[PDB]
């Protein structure tokens, strides 16, 4: 039995205790310190030595996958998907159309914030966030010359191409710190994603398809590095960020941050039912942040 | 303007005359008013005959993508989709992960209501009870036709797809119950390149095992579904549940769903679950047409 | 075990039929049937003979109590609500801030549509709904003059005013077979809303109040009469729609409707997840409104 | 403009950063970042001295409403608003049915977490439990408070109304964990018409059989809480939870809440559950001028 309390600000401001102090504060506050020990217990599993699946990447004692939905790529969620990959502390990301190419366009051109006349200026939006057509446009002209070589590759040293190979040639393309995707490629972190053309970088892969005919996108394969990597761990984390990323029917830890609702049956694990945008960065800060000296 | 009004029940149960009446009720009611007459407008476009110089599956005046979440191919919202594609009223279909086998399994097994498990071995989706059985009974009666598919790709030459694939177990279910049965019957394509995210896909990833080598392209249904939208003379998109396409225009389009904008995830949005929408929807809309679409 | 299926247009379209295959349509629209059942077992159990609280209105073998928030009374669910209450196929009203005054202005002008500027034009938007700040001026000049004759009634007659007593004289005083409140006063049917004075219609007792002093509108009465509703009903149902109307902590049969959360913790029963200007209606339609001819 | 860039954890845990980065993260990080601005402006505000002028519990420059739902007083975030309180950081606050009554019972005795009980006597408020007991306790000390109450109305001729009520409660609950406690003993008002709608209700209820004629009066705390903002020189809103307050304008104003506006239910809103937010926000802004409220 423990007692609701909230922090109490005549101790002052400890920002640790009043992160902590969530805990036994109520509602998705409780949720938020569940999901703090969720993924810190499997933080701990994954440092746990081991003395002991067509992948280069090392097995660990938990891998974790890291899902997230596009919207987040286009937010300032990013950097923290970002800081993750860099310094290795996931194994496999997954995301939903439009999350790649969301990621390698603030590469080029900046995502600006707007508010909850726009199609005029030439202008995307995105909830409060704001893409200037320009940005896809610049996209454009740098992805060309990469599919053009793309297409050489699959048909002259038979290269067969998936999702997650293009994933990361536009990671290893696109040579920059700042991108999530640079940095997974270089740590050698899958990113799988069937729905990759679904939105603008498929449109502009459609195009460039009768300029350039005969790409191939296989997702068998695909399918098979992403079981494989579920079936071979020791343990298996999740953190799965928006919802509509992965599908059920086992993960030792589990954390889910979404607002969707379960009442029109829309697809010890922990939810959080909050904006992930609030609730990521604090939840990385009292966790993955805590441990930085261990990843390195 | 117009006046806020709602059905006077004194005029007794009048059910045309109360469902026209939530035009004049408010909020997502009125929401409901301008579906269906945005529907409504779609299907007069689409039977308006193509003049002489608009000419080209055949193409008609308007082209109609139907998208729907899985979780609708588990409700009852099933049969809705199937009538509407068995008669030939939509041109395309989109789903997402799920969608295609929760159809075909119910020829084999039925779901159950429960409430809002896994000892019995019961999945939950929402207050719908899919008993384990049913995807043992599915798997039986898809490797086969997955060593067929793999045969063909071998030594026929087949270039798998996602819709292709599709089509095939629709022609392999060969009931009429099936939404995917009456597509690939009418030639309606169906697009889904989240096909093997769930159950069939971790069917297809232990049959690759025994048997390897199985492709699904997804580009060749990309330029397919692109092609569709772009040679149209005008398009209507009716989407329900959320999550199925992306944007950045449709003539005509209606949303159903129940997704929040602030985390950020004449059109006409409806903010309602659509298991008591589209069949109201339908109803007012396509099922009063439905002469003309025989 | 009951199969989910949906209603099979093949069938041709009988609007009864489509109703009734909800049930076994699944998510909301099976909470839809069993809200259906619900009601019509209060229906069924008010019909029952009975051969057998301060208040004139004759017991019946089960007490209906409709709770509704103001918004649906700005919207054409005030219709729906009106039937009822004419008919008196309710027994008690609860409402909130907003939900008295929203009936009667309705008396004196119209409501209109709009979408989901405004302030220049003189325009409260309540959704996507626009009531022209003229009809408040309206029903102002109308409240007045009753407001003089309450207070003095008070101070010569010993009249001890309660928001419910004071809902019954304006709904006496409107005078208008379209009001709620007009049929609720005729019929004997208490309206219950503490939070009577929260909005326009408190603005307006608020001015009047330094134009002629003494007014006094007494909770503790109002406590006692819902109360004893209560306590001394043979039976109870409850029918809640949009969610803050009434609290807990037994109803024999309940059905609530609205879109409000349990996760951040705002406060067989059914509820039913969706816009009440949709569902209230459709409830109506295949419950009370069959009975018609039961109530005269 | 400004361009989206979340906290970047290379620059290691600085919590003060990751908070301001908020602001330029996005969806309702951003929002929270407009929050604490809009809250740092009213205080900025309210600090500032009265001119010779503006002249007139004493006046400010900025007269600062705090509204809440019950379900926040179950919560650990009745801690924070009782901090606030307790250090005279807004001067008036309004509250829903149970706002009074569950944080009066917890000095009695505790709340408990549990998960989202009839028969043990336990009533939830989504994964908080109070056992029957604690309002069982909460009985036993009101009644006599209630017989003192009727009898200086009937024999010292004091007028009743909820904030006149809600006063004395605090004042006999006498204990510094208690919001009220603190409201009474720095003469801020407390509004709350929706009193006896519950627990506190069927309290009073059952004690007017033994000892009737208490009277509550609306109309007097209805000229209390408009005075309030009618004389003030600025004024400024936090509203956590939806439902408390209505309109038909605050110069500054934060709501904090996850309600729809699609069924009808420089100002600023958060689309979050406050027991996250509110303490984030607060630790920004008041107890960043702790100081200068002592
Ligand atoms: N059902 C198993 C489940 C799972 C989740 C996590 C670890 C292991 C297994 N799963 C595997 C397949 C998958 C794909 C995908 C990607 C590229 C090609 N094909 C499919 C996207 S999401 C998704 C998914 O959820
Ligand atoms: N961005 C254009 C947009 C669209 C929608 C409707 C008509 C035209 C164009 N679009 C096209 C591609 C697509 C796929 C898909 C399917 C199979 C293979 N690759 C991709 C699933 S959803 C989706 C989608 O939204
Ligand atoms: N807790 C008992 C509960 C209840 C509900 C239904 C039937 C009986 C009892 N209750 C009674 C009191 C009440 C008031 C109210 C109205 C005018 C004056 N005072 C209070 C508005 S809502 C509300 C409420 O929910
Ligand atoms: N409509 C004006 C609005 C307002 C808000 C804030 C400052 C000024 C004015 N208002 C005032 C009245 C009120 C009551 C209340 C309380 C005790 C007795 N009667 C009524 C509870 S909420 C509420 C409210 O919203």
């Given at each position: 039995?423990?007692?609701?309390?909230?922090?109490?600000?005549?101790?002052?401001?400890?920002?640790?205790?009043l992160?902590?102090?969530?805990?036994?504060?109520g509602?998705?506050?409780?949720?938020?310190?569940?999901?703090?020990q969720?993924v810190?217990?499997?933080?701990?599993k994954?440092?746990?030595?081991?003395?002991?699946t067509?992948?280069?990447?090392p097995?660990?004692?938990?891998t974790?996958?890291?899902?997230?939905?596009?919207?987040?790529?286009?937010?300032?969620?990013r950097?923290?998907?970002?800081?993750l990959?860099?310094?290795?502390?996931?194994?496999?990301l997954?995301?939903?159309?439009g999350?790649?190419?969301?990621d390698?366009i603030?590469?080029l051109?900046?995502?600006?914030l707007?508010?909850f006349?726009?199609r005029?200026?030439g202008?995307?939006?995105?909830?409060?966030?704001?893409v200037?057509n320009?940005?896809y446009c610049?996209?454009?002209d740098?992805?060309?010359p990469?599919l053009?070589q793309?297409v050489?590759?699959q048909?002259t040293?038979?290269?067969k191409w998936?999702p997650?190979?293009?994933?990361?040639?536009?990671?290893?393309?696109?040579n920059?710190?700042?991108?999530?995707?640079?940095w997974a490629?270089?740590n050698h972190?899958?990113?799988?994603?069937?729905?990759?053309?679904?939105?603008?970088?498929?449109?502009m892969?459609?195009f460039?398809?009768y300029?350039?005919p005969?790409?191939?996108?296989?997702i068998?394969?695909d399918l098979?590095?992403?079981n494989?990597?579920?079936?071979?761990?020791?343990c298996?984390?999740?953190?799965?960020?928006?919802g509509?990323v992965?599908?059920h029917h086992?993960?030792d830890?589990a954390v889910?941050?979404?607002?969707?609702?379960?009442?029109?049956?829309?697809?010890?694990?922990?939810?959080?039912?909050?904006?992930?945008?609030?609730?990521?960065?604090?939840?990385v800060?009292?966790?993955?942040?805590?441990?930085?000296?261990?990843?390195m």
């Amino acid at each position: 039995s423990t007692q609701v309390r909230g922090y109490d600000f005549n101790r002052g401001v400890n920002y640790r205790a009043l992160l902590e102090a969530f805990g036994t504060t109520g509602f998705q506050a409780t949720n938020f310190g569940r999901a703090v020990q969720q993924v810190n217990a499997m933080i701990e599993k994954k440092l746990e030595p081991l003395s002991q699946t067509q992948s280069r990447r090392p097995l660990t004692s938990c891998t974790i996958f890291l899902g997230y939905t596009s919207n987040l790529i286009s937010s300032g969620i990013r950097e923290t998907i970002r800081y993750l990959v860099q310094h290795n502390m996931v194994d496999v990301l997954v995301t939903t159309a439009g999350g790649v190419e969301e990621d390698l366009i603030k590469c080029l051109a900046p995502t600006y914030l707007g508010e909850f006349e726009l199609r005029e200026n030439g202008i995307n939006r995105i909830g409060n966030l704001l893409v200037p057509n320009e940005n896809y446009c610049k996209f454009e002209d740098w992805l060309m010359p990469i599919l053009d070589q793309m297409v050489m590759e699959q048909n002259t040293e038979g290269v067969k191409w998936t999702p997650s190979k293009m994933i990361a040639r536009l990671g290893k393309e696109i040579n920059n710190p700042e991108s999530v995707y640079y940095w997974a490629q270089k740590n050698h972190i899958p990113v799988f994603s069937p729905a990759l053309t679904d939105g603008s970088l498929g449109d502009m892969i459609f195009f460039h398809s009768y300029k350039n005919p005969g790409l191939v996108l296989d997702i068998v394969e695909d399918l098979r590095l992403i079981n494989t990597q579920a079936i071979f761990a020791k343990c298996t984390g999740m953190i799965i960020l928006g919802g509509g990323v992965v599908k059920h029917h086992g993960a030792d830890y589990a954390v889910y941050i979404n607002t969707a609702q379960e009442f029109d049956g829309s697809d010890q694990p922990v939810k959080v039912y909050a904006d992930a945008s609030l609730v990521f960065p604090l939840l990385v800060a009292e966790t993955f942040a805590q441990k930085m000296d261990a990843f390195m």
